[PDB]
Design a protein around this ligand. Structure first.
Ligand SMILES: Cc1cc2nc3c(=O)[nH]c(=O)nc-3n(C[C@H](O)[C@H](O)[C@H](O)COP(=O)(O)O)c2cc1C
Ligand SMILES: Cc1cc2nc3c(=O)[nH]c(=O)nc-3n(C[C@H](O)[C@H](O)[C@H](O)COP(=O)(O)O)c2cc1C
Lengths: 216, 216
């Protein structure tokens, strides 16, 4: 059950390089990335899934020097996902979303499709023109995806760790993300922990609900 | 099977107000909120869980103006969670986190505790004093929580919908959040869908991996 998963999962501090995802598992992690929800189904994201040694080494270049402890985790894990946000919400993307919803059969009529599109455009424009927060708004959706993904991979019986400890300017350059309209936010190595993962056996810790939670 | 969960869950558009969470489920959703991961275990969040008629009505004040379509979702669901971020990161919070980690048994020695605290302070200060993005950085952690939560509640067999379509100034005012040091970000009604939930039967739609996902 899912509460067991939530209580037992942890941030892996060291991975066993010999233990690879199965082909089935490697497909499943892609499914999780794709099927996360997002505001307006805006899906303002790109994922880099590095499974080869040379692909993982390219991602690991982002932690060289200043984030050396992140470096090893990225090399040892089986698969390493880089979560990227769009840097701007263009109309081409908005049309791509609504056209895919139509292709998938979500609209009974042209009127329903046009209403969907107009609604999405309205809130997108608000973020960009009035709140001046479109980059942050899209980045929030990517973090939501990360949350979904962490729980998902734990439920599959896999180990992971989310990493903000990397140099996004280096990762961005390595993969030419700026020119493509994306920026890297979180790196998540996935695989199986080694005996050197001291965090596998430490108790979890969270603030008590009497501090963080009000019931009304 | 968490992939089945991810592929079958959906954003509920209409709730059956007579179908309440069980007592155990109401505790389980609180566990999911508490046990989300977060950068540095910073846990920069507060949750309001509305389960009474009075409580839900208070939240539903925020479904005004452009956001009236959210109102029924908030009133008819069994339990409505307001996800809030801290508005600033302070040392008092940082000390609370590390002291809890110590109480839970995460540190073998004084030296280990003091290293943990120093590292957390270093990165927290980088956000607040150098990047000037601590509000955004904290809100990102809250969104991660939401993503964990939506998959969690689906895995419990519960329906939910994440809502950004509410007026956060209205909600903040109603619950006195600003003075308490928090701001409302996402509202998530939880319960069971009705037969008038048109989204329960519509196909799910996502962009193809050939657009969103690069393998290396
Ligand atoms: C967005 C995010 C970024 C994180 N960055 C790092 C990181 O760079 N290195 C690290 O060792 N752990 C990292 N963590 C892991 C957290 O310290 C961990 O999630 C937290 O202490 C709670 O522990 P748990 O994940 O074992 O439940 C990060 C977590 C999140 C959510
Ligand atoms: C952060 C966030 C905010 C959302 N805001 C709303 C909202 O105000 N009202 C609404 O009906 N749905 C809202 N949605 C639901 C999305 O439209 C939905 O997640 C998306 O179309 C994907 O469909 P699914 O959740 O059924 O998989 C929101 C989703 C997210 C993740």
């Amino acid at each position: 059950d899912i509460i067991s998963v939530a209580l037992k999962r942890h941030s892996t501090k060291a991975f066993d390089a010999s233990k690879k995802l199965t082909p089935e598992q490697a497909e499943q992690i892609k499914t999780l990335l794709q099927y996360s929800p997002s505001s307006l189904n805006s899906q303002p994201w790109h994922f880099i899934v590095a499974s080869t040694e040379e692909g993982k080494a390219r991602v690991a270049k982002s932690a060289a020097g200043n984030y050396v402890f992140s470096e090893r985790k990225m090399l040892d894990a089986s698969h390493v996902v880089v979560f990227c946000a769009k840097t701007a919400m263009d109309d081409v993307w908005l049309k791509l979303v609504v056209d895919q919803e139509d292709a998938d059969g979500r609209f009974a009529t042209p009127e329903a499709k046009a209403a969907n599109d107009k609604g999405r455009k309205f809130f997108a424009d608000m973020h960009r023109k009035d709140l001046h927060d479109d980059a942050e708004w899209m980045a929030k959706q990517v973090y939501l995806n990360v949350g979904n993904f962490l729980l998902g991979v734990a439920a599959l019986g896999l180990d992971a760790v989310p990493i903000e400890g990397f140099d996004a300017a280096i990762l961005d350059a390595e993969f030419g993300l700026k020119e493509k309209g994306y920026t890297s936010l979180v790196v998540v190595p996935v695989g199986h922990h080694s005996v050197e993962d001291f965090n596998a056996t430490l108790p979890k810790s969270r603030l008590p609900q009497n501090i963080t939670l009000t019931e009304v």
